[PDB]
């Protein structure tokens, strides 16, 4: 499922991501855009048994268990295929786990390199939410 930017934004606001740990809502939408292109079923095979999953591309070596990755930690205590869903509750709950403080968004390489410092609010402006 590929979300429209406003739809994704309203979903994320519903799940408490707006101003979560001081991160404005646009940060989250921008990160989704660059990580999975808003596709809830995105997957990405890394150079190590690792694989990134769903809309926020959560890693199988540290956050969700796929049981196919050399050394899971499953810190989110969730199966990676839970992340590959139309409903974003799991992805969001794990993301909140990942972002423990105000610098937590660095968890997403695309956000740090393509969102941090830009007008991320641009992604949600004009969205009814």
């Amino acid at each position: 499922k590929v979300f429209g930017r406003c739809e994704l934004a309203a979903a994320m606001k519903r799940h408490g991501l707006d101003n979560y740990r001081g991160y404005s809502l646009g940060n989250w939408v921008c990160a989704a855009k660059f990580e999975s292109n808003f596709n809830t079923q995105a997957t990405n095979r890394n150079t190590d048994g690792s694989t990134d999953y769903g809309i926020l591309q959560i890693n199988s070596r540290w956050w969700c268990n796929d049981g196919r990755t050399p050394g899971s930690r499953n810190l989110c205590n969730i199966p990676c295929s839970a992340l590959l869903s139309s409903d974003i509750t799991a992805s969001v709950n794990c993301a909140k786990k990942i972002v423990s403080d105000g610098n937590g968004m660095n968890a997403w390489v695309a956000w740090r390199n393509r969102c941090k410092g830009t007008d991320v609010q641009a992604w949600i402006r004009g969205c009814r939410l």
Partner: antibody
Framework: QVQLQESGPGLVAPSQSLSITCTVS????????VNWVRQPPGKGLEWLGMIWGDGNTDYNSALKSRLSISKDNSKSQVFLKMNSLHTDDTARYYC??????????WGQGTTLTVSS | DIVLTQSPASLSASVGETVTITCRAS??????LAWYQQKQGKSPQLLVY???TLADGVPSRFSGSGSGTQYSLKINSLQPEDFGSYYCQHFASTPRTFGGGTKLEIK
């Protein structure tokens, strides 16, 4: 440690330009915007413009034509270039860092006076 | 431009008193509103951002509330170091603008 330090000419006339410099430290310009704000004597704050981490710029609509903001990421410096000076440009000029829609760190401000 | 109407212009209060400073936006700013305090001859200092979030280090006697177009900064039991000026600024789009300021002074 996050630091913003402004350096300007101090006094200028309606016939020259005006370039104020904002030398930052403790953070990369690629990751944050820097806004320029001024405060006329005994007056409130006035927003001038800003440059985002990506180099895009936005300006106060009224002063947009007299302003130009640029930066050198490697020198950790941001520049406010202003022309067509008026005596109403006399103010304390501040560069402030923008971190996700709030100005969290402000420089000390440089006082500029526009003469005849 | 979205303009902000801040009031009152000046406030005379005693320590221990509670005071409210409002800022009304000419347009909906969607909660992107910050408050700053500027003390005699100092740069402004961030107090509150996104309407309600205190900045790090800011005492909890400061609380912001708002939504839509009317915003308030409340200071409960004001302390000697609270006097000075306060400004609101929006971040709803560019250009950003500030409120005219409120001078909080000793009764």
């Amino acid at each position: 440690q996050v630091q913003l330090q402004e350096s300007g000419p101090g006094l200028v006339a309606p016939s020259q330009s005006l370039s104020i410099t904002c030398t930052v430290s403790g953070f990369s310009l690629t990751g944050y915007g820097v806004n320029w704000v001024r405060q006329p004597p005994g007056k409130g704050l006035e927003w001038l413009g800003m440059i985002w981490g990506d180099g895009n710029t936005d300006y106060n609509s009224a002063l947009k034509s007299r302003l130009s903001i640029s930066k050198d990421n490697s020198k950790s410096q941001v520049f406010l270039k202003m022309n067509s000076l008026h005596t109403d440009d006399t103010a304390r000029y501040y560069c402030a860092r923008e971190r996700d829609y709030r100005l969290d760190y402000w420089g000390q401000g440089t006082t500029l006076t526009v003469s005849s | 431009d979205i303009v902000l109407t801040q009031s009152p212009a000046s406030l005379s209060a005693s320590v221990g008193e509670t005071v409210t400073i409002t800022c009304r936006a000419s347009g909906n700013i969607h909660n992107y509103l910050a408050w700053y305090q500027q003390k005699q001859g100092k740069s402004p200092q961030l107090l509150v951002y996104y309407t309600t979030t205190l900045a790090d280090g800011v005492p909890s006697r400061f609380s912001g509330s708002g939504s839509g177009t009317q915003y308030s900064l409340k200071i409960n039991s004001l302390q000697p170091e609270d006097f000075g000026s306060y400004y609101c600024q929006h971040f709803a789009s560019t250009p950003r603008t500030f409120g005219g300021g409120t001078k909080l002074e000793i009764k």
